[PDB]
Design a protein around this nucleic acid. Structure first.
Ligand SMILES: [Mg+2]
Lengths: 217, 62, 140, 155, 137, 120
RNA sequence: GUUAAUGUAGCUUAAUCAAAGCAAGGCACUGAAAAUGCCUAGAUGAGCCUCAGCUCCAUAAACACCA
């Protein structure tokens, strides 16, 4: 029984912005802020504000407000960046900045002679090569861009075997540091997608079990 | 899961009042930090990441 | 020449035989600035309906925390089972790869990591100007 | 009594003991102690996430060697006033570091543990998982002015 | 000279080596529960109870009495869970419990106790007072 | 005039009594027993009992503790026991529930501090 | 489609008083843990049968099949 070895990469980019807060979480945040304010001693700002108010009241019958007004005006003038970058486009899904609130994975499209599969980034290696060097070479030459990826461990993340004569595929997970993708208008189509998109797209049973070792968050 | 260890407070008896100040570094991103002197916006600058030539070029551009 | 070296070595040995106490942490010690404001604090007088709402909120939060902890441990156990199955499969396949994989890479020692932010980074953002200085204390 | 069958029934010193270089063998890669550092500007966030990681280690049966705090590193913010040629203080930011020390850890469990930590990592906090070295050990200690002057005059 | 133990030693099950990875209790009351559980077991060495009259230890007492009433275990459990759920569904009970101001129908509780489990407590009190030993022996 | 079991002195709790009150506060139920010197269980009231379970909510809390205390007090009065000894740990004596249990026993009529033996 | 076996909560009780004990989480307290107090949710897999039996689903290890 001939045996085939095969490697694949689970290349994961972490989110850049935090998820929206559950209303229960917001309620607890407000309650914690309230109790922290109550059990706080005094802050210097409120101390001087109260002192100035009292001395002005006593001197009238015989500032901190300006500072907070200036701070509020500066805050109003300053404009922050848009947290949402996908609800305005709704047409570009391959962008690296597609989703910022969740962790994403990259899937590439390839059409083989006999099989039309929804495969992850994948490669082969000679017996003289190691799994980590194989993964590094795969990410270096398949993506065709100068990107930095951080590897967590040498232990395999997922394993899948299929008999036609049998083949084994090892999925190894890796984390993004910075991605500078060149030649974005190429025919090769790669997209950044979430776990829901994996569940929607991944038709084969072997590739539909990646969510078992991919965290939901 | 980023909001797992965020819903907390200061667990001491004698402590000053701290406010959710929005701080920005040289990236455009914002971070919420508990801090006295409740100024809504704080911006942290940079003057040492560049070299002498880059600093001179920035001064000329200014 | 030799006497000075002998005295220097004796002083070095005496200094080495001394203690190695750590720097006291300013966080755990309350500064004396907070001893002049405790006597003026007014009470809060928490009322009954607000007490009811706070108690119910804490109970709901405790239940939610238990549920999310159960989910997170379930995720860890699923990941551990997947990793164990993969390792056993690879051990059954070939032992040399198992031996070369059950070790640690030399590039994991300086692992640096940063969490997310409240807003995404703003492109073409430039700080006006500003220098820095160290105002931390010293201890001998 | 020594000759009775019940001798040694009251022995208890073998149940309690009261009086690290990495261990690598190729397959049981149980390396030495590790230090996880959280760098933050938020007291509450840093302490909360240190508590969370300590509880996670306790549940995962990772022997926590120590859990301490690095002395505060305070930085002064000086901004350049408009029209230039003037530097004025804006505010002061205090940086805090919380350290948790773990004893033993395998490769697969390390990968899972790092995955969990970086998935649960909160805002504005820097994670640093390193080896426990002599420099790290001496960082949380007093200065040695006399010793360094003696070394300088010796050399 | 040495003599082999006449049975299992008390602390010979747990492993002496690798104590750090072995779970430990940190609670004096927990240790107290463990110790009182151990003290009731029939050890092979001389014990306090043997000398101070455990009354021949276990005794197969002859039961001369009415059979216990026959009840449906499944139906009883279903009704008890239903009652517990309907009680817990209330909110005034929750408010009373949290405010620590809630009274008890003592007469009722005594009624159900005497109905369901009073006979056994009465029998053990008769055992303690020695009625059976002097009436039937 | 019965012979109290003076003795141990080096272990806890003291076994010099005739009837001892023992309160077991598990994570789900609260039980209260009175035991003789020989260890036999004399009168017990537990929140596991259906009679208290059906009339009581949250069988672990302080109201449950006072409930079982009052039930054991009336049961002891029925059984003819007026004096017991209670030996709690220092942290247990400061607890809110067991102080209420002691107060419930006192107001129910059963008194602690078993009387001294005549010609001890 | 086969067997040696089971669905008591994460683990073991019990199934004539009663589904229990240990686990697991939030708040108060300390630098963190730990202890204590106040607490929070928990199960006899499901359908009929007489008052232990037949099926479906699920887990666990092997045999045919698709990969
Ligand atoms: Mg029952």
């Amino acid at each position: 029984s001939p045996w085939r070895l095969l490697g694949a990469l689970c290349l994961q980019r972490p989110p850049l912005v935090t998820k929206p807060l559950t209303p229960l979480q917001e309620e607890m945040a407000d309650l914690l802020q309230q109790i922290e304010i109550e059990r706080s001693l005094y802050s210097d700002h409120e101390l001087r504000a109260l002192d100035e108010a009292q001395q002005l009241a006593k001197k009238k019958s015989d500032l901190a407000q300006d500072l907070e007004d200036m701070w509020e005006q500066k805050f109003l003038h300053f404009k922050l960046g848009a947290r949402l970058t996908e609800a305005d486009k709704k047409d570009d899904r391959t962008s690296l900045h597609r989703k910022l609130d969740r962790n994403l994975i990259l899937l590439v499209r390839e059409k083989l002679g006999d099989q039309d599969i929804w495969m992850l980034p994948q490669s082969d290696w000679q017996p003289g090569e190691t799994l980590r060097q194989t993964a590094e070479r795969t990410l270096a030459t398949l993506s065709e861009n100068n990107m930095e990826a951080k590897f967590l461990g040498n232990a395999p993340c997922g394993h899948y075997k299929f008999k036609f004569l049998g083949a084994k595929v090892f999925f190894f997970k890796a984390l993004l540091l910075t991605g500078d993708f060149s030649q974005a208008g190429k025919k090769g189509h790669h997209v950044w997608v979430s776990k829901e998109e994996l569940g929607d797209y991944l038709k084969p049973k072997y590739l539909a079990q990646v969510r078992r070792f991919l965290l939901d968050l | 899961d980023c909001n797992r260890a965020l819903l907390t407070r200061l667990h001491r008896q004698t402590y000053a009042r701290l406010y959710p100040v929005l701080l920005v570094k040289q990236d455009g991103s914002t971070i919420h930090i508990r801090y006295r002197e409740p100024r809504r916006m704080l911006t942290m600058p940079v003057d040492l990441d560049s070299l002498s030539p880059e600093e001179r070029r920035a001064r000329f551009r200014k | 020449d030799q006497a000075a070296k002998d005295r220097l070595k004796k002083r070095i040995r005496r200094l080495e035989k001394a203690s190695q106490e750590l720097i006291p942490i300013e966080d755990f010690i309350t500064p004396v600035k907070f001893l002049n404001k405790e006597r003026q604090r007014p009470p809060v007088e928490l009322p009954f309906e607000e007490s009811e709402r706070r108690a119910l909120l804490l109970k709901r939060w405790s239940l939610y925390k238990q549920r999310e902890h159960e989910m997170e441990r379930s995720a860890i156990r699923s990941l551990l089972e997947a990793q164990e199955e993969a390792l056993q499969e690879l051990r059954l396949s070939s032992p040399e790869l198992h031996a070369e994989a059950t070790k640690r890479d030399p590039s994991l020692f300086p692992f640096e990591r940063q969490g997310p932010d409240y807003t995404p980074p703003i492109s073409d953002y430039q700080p006006p100007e500003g220098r820095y200085q160290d105002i931390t204390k010293v201890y001998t | 009594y020594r000759s009775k069958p019940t001798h040694g029934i009251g022995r208890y010193k073998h149940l309690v003991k009261a009086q690290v270089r990495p261990i690598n063998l190729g397959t049981d890669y149980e390396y030495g102690v590790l230090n996880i550092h959280l760098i933050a500007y938020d007291m509450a966030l840093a302490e909360s996430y240190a508590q969370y990681v300590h509880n996670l280690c306790n549940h995962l049966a990772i022997k926590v060697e120590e859990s301490y705090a690095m002395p505060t590193k305070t930085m002064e913010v000086l901004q350049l006033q408009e029209q230039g040629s003037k530097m004025f203080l804006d505010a002061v930011l205090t940086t805090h570091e919380r350290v948790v020390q773990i004893s033993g850890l395998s490769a697969t469990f390390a990968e899972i543990f790092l995955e969990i930590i970086h998935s649960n990592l909160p805002e504005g906090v820097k994670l640093s998982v390193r080896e426990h070295t002599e420099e790290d050990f001496k960082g949380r200690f007093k200065a040695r002015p006399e010793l360094e002057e003696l070394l300088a005059k010796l050399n | 000279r040495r003599a082999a133990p006449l049975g299992p030693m008390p602390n010979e099950d747990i492993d002496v080596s690798d104590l750090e990875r072995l779970k430990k209790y940190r609670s004096f009351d927990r240790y107290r529960r463990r110790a009182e559980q151990e003290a009731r077991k029939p050890h092979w060495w001389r014990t306090y109870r043997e000398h101070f009259g455990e009354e021949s230890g276990p005794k197969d007492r002859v039961d001369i009495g009415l059979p216990p009433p026959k009840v449906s275990r499944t139906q009883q459990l279903l009704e008890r869970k239903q009652a517990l759920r309907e009680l817990r569904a209330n909110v005034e009970e929750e408010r009373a419990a949290r405010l620590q101001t809630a009274r008890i129908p003592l007469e009722a509780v005594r009624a159900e106790w005497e109905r369901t489990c009073g006979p056994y407590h009465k029998q053990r009190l008769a055992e303690y007072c020695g009625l059976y030993r002097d009436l039937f022996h | 005039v019965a012979r109290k079991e003076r003795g141990w002195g080096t272990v806890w709790p003291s076994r010099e009594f005739w009837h001892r009150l023992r309160v077991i506060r598990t994570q789900h139920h609260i039980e209260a027993l009175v035991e003789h010197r020989n260890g036999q269980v004399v009168v017990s009231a537990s929140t596991r009992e259906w009679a208290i379970k059906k009339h009581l909510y949250s069988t672990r809390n302080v109201v449950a503790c006072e409930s079982v205390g009052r039930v054991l007090a009336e049961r002891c009065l029925e059984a003819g026991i007026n004096f017991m000894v209670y030996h709690p740990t220092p942290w247990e004596a400061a607890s809110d529930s067991i102080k209420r249990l002691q107060h419930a026993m006192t107001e129910g009529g059963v008194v602690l501090r078993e009387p001294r033996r005549i010609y001890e």
